[PDB]
mmCIF file of C-alpha atoms and ligand atoms in Angstrom:
data_model
loop_
_atom_site.group_PDB
_atom_site.id
_atom_site.type_symbol
_atom_site.label_atom_id
_atom_site.label_comp_id
_atom_site.label_asym_id
_atom_site.label_seq_id
_atom_site.Cartn_x
_atom_site.Cartn_y
_atom_site.Cartn_z
ATOM 1 C CA UNK U 1 0.729 9.926 -0.917
ATOM 2 C CA UNK U 2 0.430 7.057 -2.688
ATOM 3 C CA UNK U 3 -1.790 3.817 -1.886
ATOM 4 C CA UNK U 4 -0.374 0.576 -2.925
ATOM 5 C CA UNK U 5 -2.998 -2.726 -3.258
ATOM 6 C CA UNK U 6 -1.697 -6.077 -4.566
ATOM 7 C CA UNK U 7 -3.776 -7.351 -7.476
ATOM 8 C CA UNK U 8 -1.758 -10.541 -7.876
ATOM 9 C CA UNK U 9 1.784 -11.706 -6.142
ATOM 10 C CA UNK U 10 5.374 -11.029 -7.111
ATOM 11 C CA UNK U 11 8.402 -13.369 -6.033
ATOM 12 C CA UNK U 12 8.206 -11.361 -2.565
ATOM 13 C CA UNK U 13 12.184 -11.092 -2.506
ATOM 14 C CA UNK U 14 13.195 -9.265 -5.199
ATOM 15 C CA UNK U 15 12.232 -5.737 -4.794
ATOM 16 C CA UNK U 16 13.662 -1.873 -7.082
ATOM 17 C CA UNK U 17 17.024 -0.871 -5.700
ATOM 18 C CA UNK U 18 18.235 2.577 -6.252
ATOM 19 C CA UNK U 19 20.027 2.474 -9.600
ATOM 20 C CA UNK U 20 18.413 -0.253 -11.175
ATOM 21 C CA UNK U 21 16.218 -0.013 -14.268
ATOM 22 C CA UNK U 22 12.600 -0.680 -13.903
ATOM 23 C CA UNK U 23 10.523 -2.365 -16.631
ATOM 24 C CA UNK U 24 6.749 -2.386 -16.275
ATOM 25 C CA UNK U 25 3.321 -2.223 -17.901
ATOM 26 C CA UNK U 26 0.689 0.163 -16.894
ATOM 27 C CA UNK U 27 -2.800 1.257 -17.677
ATOM 28 C CA UNK U 28 -3.409 5.087 -16.255
ATOM 29 C CA UNK U 29 -6.720 6.032 -15.375
ATOM 30 C CA UNK U 30 -8.645 8.781 -13.682
ATOM 31 C CA UNK U 31 -10.531 8.455 -10.412
ATOM 32 C CA UNK U 32 -13.875 7.441 -12.379
ATOM 33 C CA UNK U 33 -12.207 4.714 -14.733
ATOM 34 C CA UNK U 34 -11.559 7.056 -17.589
ATOM 35 C CA UNK U 35 -8.441 5.264 -19.483
ATOM 36 C CA UNK U 36 -5.876 7.976 -20.453
ATOM 37 C CA UNK U 37 -2.812 5.920 -21.410
ATOM 38 C CA UNK U 38 -1.786 2.424 -21.515
ATOM 39 C CA UNK U 39 1.722 0.712 -22.442
ATOM 40 C CA UNK U 40 -0.106 -2.872 -23.155
ATOM 41 C CA UNK U 41 -1.956 -0.895 -26.027
ATOM 42 C CA UNK U 42 1.378 -0.290 -27.851
ATOM 43 C CA UNK U 43 2.892 -3.697 -26.807
ATOM 44 C CA UNK U 44 6.069 -1.815 -25.580
ATOM 45 C CA UNK U 45 7.285 -1.711 -21.995
ATOM 46 C CA UNK U 46 7.778 1.236 -19.942
ATOM 47 C CA UNK U 47 11.338 1.919 -18.548
ATOM 48 C CA UNK U 48 12.889 4.240 -16.032
ATOM 49 C CA UNK U 49 15.586 4.419 -13.183
ATOM 50 C CA UNK U 50 14.708 4.167 -9.453
ATOM 51 C CA UNK U 51 16.046 7.212 -7.770
ATOM 52 C CA UNK U 52 16.939 9.416 -10.582
ATOM 53 C CA UNK U 53 13.570 11.386 -10.610
ATOM 54 C CA UNK U 54 12.534 10.262 -14.008
ATOM 55 C CA UNK U 55 8.793 9.769 -13.389
ATOM 56 C CA UNK U 56 6.342 11.368 -10.972
ATOM 57 C CA UNK U 57 6.538 10.664 -6.989
ATOM 58 C CA UNK U 58 3.596 8.635 -6.737
ATOM 59 C CA UNK U 59 5.545 5.697 -9.386
ATOM 60 C CA UNK U 60 9.126 6.463 -7.294
ATOM 61 C CA UNK U 61 7.821 5.454 -4.028
ATOM 62 C CA UNK U 62 4.795 2.979 -5.204
ATOM 63 C CA UNK U 63 6.690 0.759 -7.524
ATOM 64 C CA UNK U 64 9.793 0.339 -4.653
ATOM 65 C CA UNK U 65 7.351 -1.646 -2.938
ATOM 66 C CA UNK U 66 6.688 -3.947 -5.463
ATOM 67 C CA UNK U 67 8.470 -7.529 -6.300
ATOM 68 C CA UNK U 68 9.195 -8.662 -9.819
ATOM 69 C CA UNK U 69 5.984 -10.230 -11.298
ATOM 70 C CA UNK U 70 3.543 -8.636 -8.991
ATOM 71 C CA UNK U 71 0.373 -6.573 -10.865
ATOM 72 C CA UNK U 72 -0.498 -3.646 -8.386
ATOM 73 C CA UNK U 73 -2.786 -0.795 -8.211
ATOM 74 C CA UNK U 74 -1.618 2.504 -7.397
ATOM 75 C CA UNK U 75 -4.033 5.252 -6.197
ATOM 76 C CA UNK U 76 -1.758 8.361 -6.456
ATOM 77 C CA UNK U 77 -2.994 11.912 -5.009
ATOM 78 C CA UNK U 78 -2.714 15.195 -7.221
ATOM 79 C CA UNK U 79 0.590 16.230 -4.915
ATOM 80 C CA UNK U 80 2.336 13.379 -6.013
ATOM 81 C CA UNK U 81 1.354 13.835 -9.504
ATOM 82 C CA UNK U 82 0.487 16.578 -11.926
ATOM 83 C CA UNK U 83 -0.854 18.990 -9.127
ATOM 84 C CA UNK U 84 -3.043 21.825 -9.909
ATOM 85 C CA UNK U 85 -1.640 22.464 -13.503
ATOM 86 C CA UNK U 86 -2.161 18.996 -14.475
ATOM 87 C CA UNK U 87 -0.479 17.903 -18.014
ATOM 88 C CA UNK U 88 -1.543 19.994 -20.849
ATOM 89 C CA UNK U 89 -4.364 18.284 -23.115
ATOM 90 C CA UNK U 90 -4.497 14.781 -21.348
ATOM 91 C CA UNK U 91 -4.485 15.272 -17.387
ATOM 92 C CA UNK U 92 -6.662 17.710 -15.567
ATOM 93 C CA UNK U 93 -6.347 19.722 -12.559
ATOM 94 C CA UNK U 94 -6.487 18.211 -9.078
ATOM 95 C CA UNK U 95 -6.396 14.746 -10.729
ATOM 96 C CA UNK U 96 -6.167 11.629 -8.665
ATOM 97 C CA UNK U 97 -4.823 8.793 -10.964
ATOM 98 C CA UNK U 98 -4.891 5.152 -10.686
ATOM 99 C CA UNK U 99 -2.338 2.991 -12.125
ATOM 100 C CA UNK U 100 -2.647 -0.808 -12.848
ATOM 101 C CA UNK U 101 1.055 -1.443 -12.694
ATOM 102 C CA UNK U 102 3.149 -4.841 -13.072
ATOM 103 C CA UNK U 103 6.782 -5.047 -12.468
ATOM 104 C CA UNK U 104 8.166 -7.398 -15.330
ATOM 105 C CA UNK U 105 12.106 -6.940 -14.850
ATOM 106 C CA UNK U 106 14.829 -5.424 -13.157
ATOM 107 C CA UNK U 107 18.234 -4.517 -14.800
ATOM 108 C CA UNK E 1 -9.695 -4.647 0.296
ATOM 109 C CA UNK E 2 -6.107 -3.310 2.121
ATOM 110 C CA UNK E 3 -4.432 -0.415 0.732
ATOM 111 C CA UNK E 4 -0.557 0.079 2.083
ATOM 112 C CA UNK E 5 0.959 3.540 2.373
ATOM 113 C CA UNK E 6 4.358 3.427 3.617
ATOM 114 C CA UNK E 7 5.299 6.195 5.825
ATOM 115 C CA UNK E 8 8.963 4.825 6.417
ATOM 116 C CA UNK E 9 10.782 2.199 4.700
ATOM 117 C CA UNK E 10 11.677 -1.229 6.251
ATOM 118 C CA UNK E 11 14.693 -3.262 5.671
ATOM 119 C CA UNK E 12 13.202 -4.206 2.583
ATOM 120 C CA UNK E 13 14.576 -7.663 3.146
ATOM 121 C CA UNK E 14 12.936 -9.702 6.492
ATOM 122 C CA UNK E 15 8.961 -10.190 5.877
ATOM 123 C CA UNK E 16 7.307 -12.449 8.344
ATOM 124 C CA UNK E 17 6.408 -16.001 7.305
ATOM 125 C CA UNK E 18 3.156 -17.587 7.917
ATOM 126 C CA UNK E 19 3.792 -19.053 11.497
ATOM 127 C CA UNK E 20 6.170 -16.085 12.923
ATOM 128 C CA UNK E 21 4.980 -13.302 15.952
ATOM 129 C CA UNK E 22 4.838 -9.957 14.664
ATOM 130 C CA UNK E 23 5.656 -7.450 17.281
ATOM 131 C CA UNK E 24 3.847 -3.917 16.473
ATOM 132 C CA UNK E 25 2.981 -0.638 17.551
ATOM 133 C CA UNK E 26 -0.441 0.492 16.019
ATOM 134 C CA UNK E 27 -2.811 3.393 16.211
ATOM 135 C CA UNK E 28 -6.339 2.387 15.057
ATOM 136 C CA UNK E 29 -8.211 5.501 13.235
ATOM 137 C CA UNK E 30 -11.757 5.724 11.934
ATOM 138 C CA UNK E 31 -12.454 6.953 8.194
ATOM 139 C CA UNK E 32 -12.485 10.829 9.683
ATOM 140 C CA UNK E 33 -9.566 10.576 11.740
ATOM 141 C CA UNK E 34 -10.733 9.845 15.085
ATOM 142 C CA UNK E 35 -8.650 7.336 16.789
ATOM 143 C CA UNK E 36 -10.265 4.531 18.784
ATOM 144 C CA UNK E 37 -7.199 2.954 19.991
ATOM 145 C CA UNK E 38 -3.343 2.873 20.231
ATOM 146 C CA UNK E 39 -0.805 0.425 21.455
ATOM 147 C CA UNK E 40 1.329 3.392 21.510
ATOM 148 C CA UNK E 41 -1.063 5.714 24.309
ATOM 149 C CA UNK E 42 -0.511 2.277 26.959
ATOM 150 C CA UNK E 43 3.267 1.672 25.626
ATOM 151 C CA UNK E 44 2.367 -1.861 24.972
ATOM 152 C CA UNK E 45 3.528 -3.320 21.702
ATOM 153 C CA UNK E 46 1.350 -5.886 20.180
ATOM 154 C CA UNK E 47 2.062 -9.297 19.093
ATOM 155 C CA UNK E 48 -0.136 -11.741 16.880
ATOM 156 C CA UNK E 49 0.626 -14.822 15.042
ATOM 157 C CA UNK E 50 0.781 -14.574 11.373
ATOM 158 C CA UNK E 51 -1.458 -17.446 9.908
ATOM 159 C CA UNK E 52 -3.779 -18.366 13.214
ATOM 160 C CA UNK E 53 -7.239 -16.058 12.044
ATOM 161 C CA UNK E 54 -6.875 -14.031 15.233
ATOM 162 C CA UNK E 55 -6.708 -10.705 13.976
ATOM 163 C CA UNK E 56 -8.947 -9.033 10.822
ATOM 164 C CA UNK E 57 -8.193 -10.486 7.406
ATOM 165 C CA UNK E 58 -6.813 -6.938 6.790
ATOM 166 C CA UNK E 59 -4.059 -7.200 9.086
ATOM 167 C CA UNK E 60 -3.327 -10.742 7.816
ATOM 168 C CA UNK E 61 -2.638 -9.408 4.277
ATOM 169 C CA UNK E 62 -1.584 -6.043 5.284
ATOM 170 C CA UNK E 63 1.069 -7.189 7.439
ATOM 171 C CA UNK E 64 2.249 -9.935 5.568
ATOM 172 C CA UNK E 65 3.333 -7.485 3.007
ATOM 173 C CA UNK E 66 5.878 -5.311 5.391
ATOM 174 C CA UNK E 67 9.214 -5.706 6.254
ATOM 175 C CA UNK E 68 11.088 -5.066 9.708
ATOM 176 C CA UNK E 69 11.204 -1.428 10.712
ATOM 177 C CA UNK E 70 8.609 -0.410 8.229
ATOM 178 C CA UNK E 71 5.873 2.144 9.378
ATOM 179 C CA UNK E 72 2.657 1.878 6.975
ATOM 180 C CA UNK E 73 -0.830 2.954 6.863
ATOM 181 C CA UNK E 74 -3.304 0.472 6.452
ATOM 182 C CA UNK E 75 -6.937 1.190 5.049
ATOM 183 C CA UNK E 76 -9.141 -1.521 5.469
ATOM 184 C CA UNK E 77 -12.619 -2.129 3.607
ATOM 185 C CA UNK E 78 -15.427 -3.147 5.648
ATOM 186 C CA UNK E 79 -15.366 -6.824 4.429
ATOM 187 C CA UNK E 80 -11.910 -6.881 5.789
ATOM 188 C CA UNK E 81 -12.507 -5.847 9.198
ATOM 189 C CA UNK E 82 -15.769 -5.884 11.576
ATOM 190 C CA UNK E 83 -18.059 -6.174 8.095
ATOM 191 C CA UNK E 84 -21.990 -5.213 8.452
ATOM 192 C CA UNK E 85 -22.825 -5.571 11.920
ATOM 193 C CA UNK E 86 -21.674 -2.470 13.819
ATOM 194 C CA UNK E 87 -20.700 -2.131 17.521
ATOM 195 C CA UNK E 88 -22.283 0.864 18.766
ATOM 196 C CA UNK E 89 -19.682 3.273 20.342
ATOM 197 C CA UNK E 90 -16.736 2.326 19.257
ATOM 198 C CA UNK E 91 -16.948 0.961 15.297
ATOM 199 C CA UNK E 92 -20.078 1.698 13.222
ATOM 200 C CA UNK E 93 -21.767 -0.638 10.820
ATOM 201 C CA UNK E 94 -19.588 -0.809 7.644
ATOM 202 C CA UNK E 95 -16.868 0.748 8.834
ATOM 203 C CA UNK E 96 -13.355 1.451 6.735
ATOM 204 C CA UNK E 97 -10.689 1.615 9.338
ATOM 205 C CA UNK E 98 -7.060 3.197 9.062
ATOM 206 C CA UNK E 99 -4.346 1.867 11.153
ATOM 207 C CA UNK E 100 -0.899 3.208 11.578
ATOM 208 C CA UNK E 101 1.402 0.346 11.745
ATOM 209 C CA UNK E 102 5.176 -0.228 12.542
ATOM 210 C CA UNK E 103 6.765 -3.389 12.511
ATOM 211 C CA UNK E 104 9.232 -3.716 15.376
ATOM 212 C CA UNK E 105 10.637 -7.188 15.025
ATOM 213 C CA UNK E 106 9.609 -10.844 14.551
ATOM 214 C CA UNK E 107 9.587 -13.787 17.155
HETATM 215 C C1 858 R 201 8.767 14.612 -23.122
HETATM 216 C C2 858 R 201 8.131 13.485 -23.743
HETATM 217 C C3 858 R 201 8.239 12.275 -22.834
HETATM 218 C C4 858 R 201 7.526 10.870 -22.983
HETATM 219 C C5 858 R 201 8.135 9.527 -22.900
HETATM 220 C C6 858 R 201 9.491 9.276 -22.610
HETATM 221 C C7 858 R 201 6.981 8.275 -23.414
HETATM 222 C C8 858 R 201 6.298 8.165 -22.301
HETATM 223 C C9 858 R 201 5.741 6.285 -22.251
HETATM 224 C C10 858 R 201 5.453 8.619 -21.591
HETATM 225 C C11 858 R 201 4.006 8.634 -22.023
HETATM 226 O O1 858 R 201 3.862 8.850 -23.240
HETATM 227 C C12 858 R 201 2.784 8.316 -24.128
HETATM 228 C C13 858 R 201 3.008 9.186 -21.649
HETATM 229 O O2 858 R 201 2.526 9.006 -20.412
HETATM 230 C C14 858 R 201 1.193 9.623 -19.434
HETATM 231 O O3 858 R 201 0.402 9.123 -20.038
HETATM 232 C C15 858 R 201 1.493 8.706 -17.960
HETATM 233 O O4 858 R 201 1.084 7.765 -18.120
HETATM 234 C C16 858 R 201 2.151 9.074 -16.873
HETATM 235 O O5 858 R 201 1.281 9.329 -15.980
HETATM 236 N N1 858 R 201 3.580 8.492 -16.901
HETATM 237 C C17 858 R 201 4.212 7.784 -17.319
HETATM 238 C C18 858 R 201 4.692 6.534 -17.012
HETATM 239 C C19 858 R 201 5.646 6.796 -15.949
HETATM 240 C C20 858 R 201 4.702 7.634 -14.847
HETATM 241 C C21 858 R 201 4.161 8.827 -15.631
HETATM 242 C C22 858 R 201 5.107 9.909 -15.552
HETATM 243 O O6 858 R 201 6.122 10.217 -15.020
HETATM 244 O O7 858 R 201 5.428 10.582 -16.926
HETATM 245 C C23 858 R 201 6.499 11.517 -17.070
HETATM 246 C C24 858 R 201 5.621 13.075 -17.080
HETATM 247 C C25 858 R 201 4.543 12.992 -18.115
HETATM 248 C C26 858 R 201 6.240 13.865 -16.486
HETATM 249 C C27 858 R 201 5.957 15.663 -16.252
HETATM 250 C C28 858 R 201 7.047 16.065 -17.146
HETATM 251 C C29 858 R 201 6.912 17.406 -16.577
HETATM 252 C C30 858 R 201 6.595 18.230 -15.370
HETATM 253 O O8 858 R 201 6.607 19.473 -14.975
HETATM 254 C C31 858 R 201 7.244 20.192 -15.563
HETATM 255 C C32 858 R 201 8.878 20.464 -15.601
HETATM 256 C C33 858 R 201 9.438 21.324 -16.176
HETATM 257 C C34 858 R 201 9.086 22.495 -16.824
HETATM 258 C C35 858 R 201 7.247 22.801 -16.749
HETATM 259 C C36 858 R 201 7.185 23.832 -17.205
HETATM 260 C C37 858 R 201 8.381 24.434 -17.952
HETATM 261 N N2 858 R 201 9.442 23.579 -17.363
HETATM 262 C C38 858 R 201 10.975 23.452 -17.640
HETATM 263 C C39 858 R 201 11.292 24.889 -17.982
HETATM 264 C C40 858 R 201 6.805 21.484 -16.177
HETATM 265 C C41 858 R 201 5.897 17.237 -14.402
HETATM 266 O O9 858 R 201 5.822 17.643 -13.263
HETATM 267 C C42 858 R 201 4.653 17.337 -12.125
HETATM 268 C C43 858 R 201 5.952 15.383 -14.471
HETATM 269 C C44 858 R 201 7.158 11.174 -18.299
HETATM 270 C C45 858 R 201 7.556 9.655 -18.221
HETATM 271 C C46 858 R 201 8.181 12.359 -18.375
HETATM 272 O O10 858 R 201 9.692 11.649 -17.596
HETATM 273 C C47 858 R 201 8.786 12.117 -20.029
HETATM 274 C C48 858 R 201 8.164 12.567 -21.205
HETATM 275 O O11 858 R 201 7.395 13.355 -21.103
HETATM 276 C C49 858 R 201 1.984 10.983 -18.738
HETATM 277 C C50 858 R 201 0.440 11.775 -18.237
HETATM 278 C C51 858 R 201 2.061 11.548 -20.312
HETATM 279 C C52 858 R 201 3.356 10.827 -20.758
HETATM 280 O O12 858 R 201 3.555 11.618 -22.146
HETATM 281 C C53 858 R 201 3.756 12.664 -22.362
HETATM 282 C C1 858 R 202 -10.163 -11.884 23.999
HETATM 283 C C2 858 R 202 -9.595 -10.610 24.098
HETATM 284 C C3 858 R 202 -8.502 -9.929 23.128
HETATM 285 C C4 858 R 202 -8.013 -8.931 23.517
HETATM 286 C C5 858 R 202 -6.500 -8.430 23.715
HETATM 287 C C6 858 R 202 -5.374 -9.860 23.406
HETATM 288 C C7 858 R 202 -6.326 -7.017 23.808
HETATM 289 C C8 858 R 202 -5.813 -6.454 22.331
HETATM 290 C C9 858 R 202 -4.718 -5.106 22.347
HETATM 291 C C10 858 R 202 -7.191 -6.025 21.501
HETATM 292 C C11 858 R 202 -7.351 -4.555 21.770
HETATM 293 O O1 858 R 202 -8.091 -4.250 23.206
HETATM 294 C C12 858 R 202 -7.745 -2.727 23.352
HETATM 295 C C13 858 R 202 -8.679 -4.188 21.495
HETATM 296 O O2 858 R 202 -8.208 -3.545 19.977
HETATM 297 C C14 858 R 202 -8.872 -2.803 18.918
HETATM 298 O O3 858 R 202 -9.167 -1.617 19.691
HETATM 299 C C15 858 R 202 -8.404 -2.964 17.519
HETATM 300 O O4 858 R 202 -7.298 -1.607 17.782
HETATM 301 C C16 858 R 202 -8.306 -3.777 16.771
HETATM 302 O O5 858 R 202 -9.257 -3.659 15.706
HETATM 303 N N1 858 R 202 -7.630 -4.682 16.709
HETATM 304 C C17 858 R 202 -6.551 -4.700 17.408
HETATM 305 C C18 858 R 202 -4.826 -4.740 16.715
HETATM 306 C C19 858 R 202 -4.989 -5.942 15.530
HETATM 307 C C20 858 R 202 -6.161 -5.578 14.808
HETATM 308 C C21 858 R 202 -7.443 -5.873 15.472
HETATM 309 C C22 858 R 202 -7.756 -7.174 15.994
HETATM 310 O O6 858 R 202 -7.892 -7.910 14.937
HETATM 311 O O7 858 R 202 -8.021 -7.251 16.955
HETATM 312 C C23 858 R 202 -8.389 -8.810 17.740
HETATM 313 C C24 858 R 202 -9.761 -8.873 17.449
HETATM 314 C C25 858 R 202 -10.841 -8.059 18.116
HETATM 315 C C26 858 R 202 -10.322 -9.553 16.167
HETATM 316 C C27 858 R 202 -11.909 -10.031 16.378
HETATM 317 C C28 858 R 202 -12.247 -11.159 17.176
HETATM 318 C C29 858 R 202 -13.553 -11.642 17.137
HETATM 319 C C30 858 R 202 -14.337 -11.554 15.826
HETATM 320 O O8 858 R 202 -15.699 -11.753 15.806
HETATM 321 C C31 858 R 202 -16.436 -13.035 15.667
HETATM 322 C C32 858 R 202 -16.227 -13.391 14.079
HETATM 323 C C33 858 R 202 -17.124 -14.088 13.964
HETATM 324 C C34 858 R 202 -17.931 -15.130 14.869
HETATM 325 C C35 858 R 202 -17.819 -14.696 16.460
HETATM 326 C C36 858 R 202 -18.247 -15.476 17.013
HETATM 327 C C37 858 R 202 -19.256 -16.599 16.625
HETATM 328 N N2 858 R 202 -18.519 -15.875 15.020
HETATM 329 C C38 858 R 202 -19.079 -16.880 13.856
HETATM 330 C C39 858 R 202 -20.096 -16.151 12.854
HETATM 331 C C40 858 R 202 -16.787 -13.667 16.514
HETATM 332 C C41 858 R 202 -14.122 -10.274 14.630
HETATM 333 O O9 858 R 202 -14.532 -10.951 13.499
HETATM 334 C C42 858 R 202 -14.350 -9.748 12.510
HETATM 335 C C43 858 R 202 -12.357 -10.114 14.753
HETATM 336 C C44 858 R 202 -7.926 -9.313 19.026
HETATM 337 C C45 858 R 202 -6.563 -8.685 19.183
HETATM 338 C C46 858 R 202 -8.392 -10.538 19.378
HETATM 339 O O10 858 R 202 -7.636 -11.561 18.449
HETATM 340 C C47 858 R 202 -8.010 -11.020 20.838
HETATM 341 C C48 858 R 202 -9.160 -10.230 21.612
HETATM 342 O O11 858 R 202 -9.877 -9.661 21.400
HETATM 343 C C49 858 R 202 -10.668 -3.639 18.767
HETATM 344 C C50 858 R 202 -11.503 -2.640 18.158
HETATM 345 C C51 858 R 202 -11.175 -4.170 19.946
HETATM 346 C C52 858 R 202 -9.934 -5.257 20.722
HETATM 347 O O12 858 R 202 -10.213 -5.588 22.236
HETATM 348 C C53 858 R 202 -11.000 -6.642 21.990
HETATM 349 C C1 B7G R 203 -15.796 -2.906 18.910
HETATM 350 C C2 B7G R 203 -15.405 -4.139 18.086
HETATM 351 C C3 B7G R 203 -15.725 -5.402 19.390
HETATM 352 C C4 B7G R 203 -15.300 -6.922 18.950
HETATM 353 C C5 B7G R 203 -15.930 -8.023 19.374
HETATM 354 C C6 B7G R 203 -17.486 -8.350 19.485
HETATM 355 C C7 B7G R 203 -17.702 -9.372 18.095
HETATM 356 O O1 B7G R 203 -18.751 -9.768 17.837
HETATM 357 C C8 B7G R 203 -19.220 -9.914 16.648
HETATM 358 O O2 B7G R 203 -18.567 -9.000 15.681
HETATM 359 C C9 B7G R 203 -18.706 -9.698 14.206
HETATM 360 C C10 B7G R 203 -18.059 -8.571 13.680
HETATM 361 O O3 B7G R 203 -18.258 -6.940 13.754
HETATM 362 C C11 B7G R 203 -20.235 -9.776 13.947
HETATM 363 O O4 B7G R 203 -20.002 -10.712 12.415
HETATM 364 C C12 B7G R 203 -20.713 -10.958 14.750
HETATM 365 O O5 B7G R 203 -22.133 -11.254 14.473
HETATM 366 C C13 B7G R 203 -20.786 -10.358 16.306
HETATM 367 O O6 B7G R 203 -21.010 -11.355 16.963
#
């Protein structure tokens, strides 16, 4: 599944609800540190609606536990991400992913 | 540190404040699935006061981020549990523990 470890606390009260849009900042890394992508590098936050199956499973359940302002490390297993096929030219097969995510705002 | 993996969601609203009694149902397991204790087996809900350093650090920080009704898996690193000194027969030296915990209510 997805393991959630808090790095820095949020407000501890405002959590993502079904139908809301989550604006977050992230950095995707492989099990061995190799950074593969980062929204921080492009200076543009990422957005997705909760409960609409837009992002990989690890993200859907992982970010739903975070509160506004919280920075957390999500460890996601292959079955909750790209599985055995992986993703062409970027994510290897049976890859365990670790994301440094920060929930910026809900709207 | 401590890693939380939510099995079943909680109300997402009621969180234990430092000074309240948490009533839980846990199952203590070792890194390799081997169970060493369970409140479930003896059907006796465990209670501890959040704040007073009664329990291991992992539980203090882990349960603090759970809401009533939530059932999660706490993966505690040695430094947040019993550390270096092992206790032959039950918990080995520098062991990572896994606790299946369900938050029943607050008192
Ligand atoms: C179109 C471009 C579109 C690009 C954008 C909006 C810009 C974004 C900022 C994404 C980034 O752009 C730099 C980049 O971000 C990553 O780096 C990443 O960090 C990551 O992990 N993210 C992104 C952040 C949220 C979590 C996760 C994700 O959710 O990403 C999603 C993802 C990659 C999911 C897979 C889609 C295909 C499924 O499989 C299928 C589905 C249908 C299929 C087949 C085969 C045939 N069919 C149909 C007949 C296979 C597979 O199923 C596990 C899941 C992203 C957000 C998609 O929703 C939307 C897109 O891809 C990805 C590694 C690659 C991705 O760029 C690409
Ligand atoms: C009095 C009996 C009292 C017993 C009960 C109320 C019955 C309970 C249902 C406990 C269970 O009884 C089946 C049993 O539960 C385990 O099975 C377990 O599942 C577990 O892990 N639990 C219990 C559930 C919460 C998490 C964790 C815990 O936190 O439990 C706490 C625990 C054991 C904390 C340690 C205390 C000692 C510290 O040691 C130190 C540290 C530093 C010290 C000294 C002395 C000097 N110094 C200075 C250097 C001692 C050590 O420090 C890391 C931390 C428990 C709740 C204590 O608060 C209270 C008790 O023990 C343990 C494997 C053994 C434990 O039986 C005991
Ligand atoms: C099976 C667990 C039994 C728990 C009760 C006994 C606790 O003993 C103490 O445990 C601490 C961490 O292990 C050590 O730092 C202490 O030096 C040691 O005296």
